[PDB]
Structures are given as C-alpha cells and as structure tokens.
Amino acid sequence: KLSEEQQHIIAILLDAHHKTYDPTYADFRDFRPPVRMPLSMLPHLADLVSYSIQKVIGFAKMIPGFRDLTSDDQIVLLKSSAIEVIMLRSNQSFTMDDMSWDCGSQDYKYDVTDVSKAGHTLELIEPLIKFQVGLKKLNLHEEEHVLLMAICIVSPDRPGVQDAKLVEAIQDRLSNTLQTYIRCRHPPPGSHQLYAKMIQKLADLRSLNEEHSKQYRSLSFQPENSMKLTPLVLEVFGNE
C-alpha cells in the first residue's frame, strides 16, 4: 500500500514545490509595475509569467527521471506545458473570496479585468476562471497538487516528443503514485473518481493552452506589443 519509492517521489515533488513556489513580493517589486487603467497590464504580467516559467523549469528539473531525457525532450516538454503549469500553480494564490489571484497587496492582486488588460478576452478568461474554481472545488492535497503538475509536464503525448517511451515510463510511475496516494490517503467519498477528475483538469489545460496560443500568436504578431515581452517568454512561447 504505497511503496517507500512512491513516498520518495512525493517527498521530492513536495520539496521541489516548496523551493520553486516562493513568491516574496520582493521578487514582485522587480517586475515592470502593474499599470491598471489597453495592454497596460501586459508588461507586468509578462514579467510575472517570465519569472514563473523559471520556477516551473526549476520544478521540472526536480522531477525524478526528467533529467534522464535528452535536452530536446525536456525543452519540448517545458515550452509545451509552461503556461499550463503556471495556471495550475497559480491556484494557490487564487481566491474564491472574489475570483482573483491575490498575492498580498492590491498591487499584486489580479482579477479578470487585469487579465483582459494584458490582451485576453473571455475566450480564455471564462474557461480559465472555471478551471480555478473547479480546482478549488476538488480541494486537492498538496501531495496531489504537486503530482498533477509533474504529470502535466512529463506527458508522452505532447507533439514534438522524440522518446515518448521514456517519457511514458516516467509519467506512469507518477500516475501510479498518484492513484495509490488517492486510494490510501485521500478520504472517501472525496477519493471517488478523483484521479479521473484530475486528468480532466489536465485536458482542460490543453484547451486553455490552445486558447492562449491563438491570442498569443495574434499579439506577438504586433511588434509594439511583442517588444514588451521578455526574451524567455519569446523563447518558450514562440517567435517569428
């Protein structure tokens, strides 16, 4: 009932998360300031996103086996799940109180109007908010949370992956660790179909990613806006 190895994997991911999920506002002060009135929030959010991508990479690098992949598979996996993992990890600062990502101050409090002020419409926002709420409603354990992020990143079906077989063996160990964790530690009836609901969330992330990309390609197609991005965001999300 949950090998020492599986407990080990979980300990690793919880650690990786505590080390990579550490917003301090001191780090937030270093971003372009949030200009709330269009695209007035694009500079600030571009920096938050850019900062976050680094966190995800640090987290990813901590996933058992991830380091055993060629640089291209890792690369492919990261620029493929970056936005997804970020929307995922952000659920920690998201608050039901008022449907926003509150990171302390009113300055670092982001709501629907802020996201649209960064270039998005409800095309992305509606399903995004729905994702955050649904995520809260699942009331996941931190253990489940960290496993879902690792599984999101090391996904065999991401177009562009070369050695899906090794990516698969990795994801499988993680999936099994998750399922076993849910059966043995998550309280019933809350554990019923939990794994399935977590997979569905990952499916919703794929959709959100597509929606991001549609708008992103559009926006990045406009130089005056594209010049307000960071080199890393351009490198990971794409450029022409």
Partner: peptide, 10 residues
C-alpha cells in the same frame, strides 16, 4: 535554438 531555456536546465 533555446539558449536561455537550455542554460536554465543546466
């Protein structure tokens, strides 16, 4: 190529 990403993976 992905210079920064590669570097970050180090």
């Amino acid at each position: 190529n992905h210079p920064m990403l590669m570097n970050l993976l180090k």
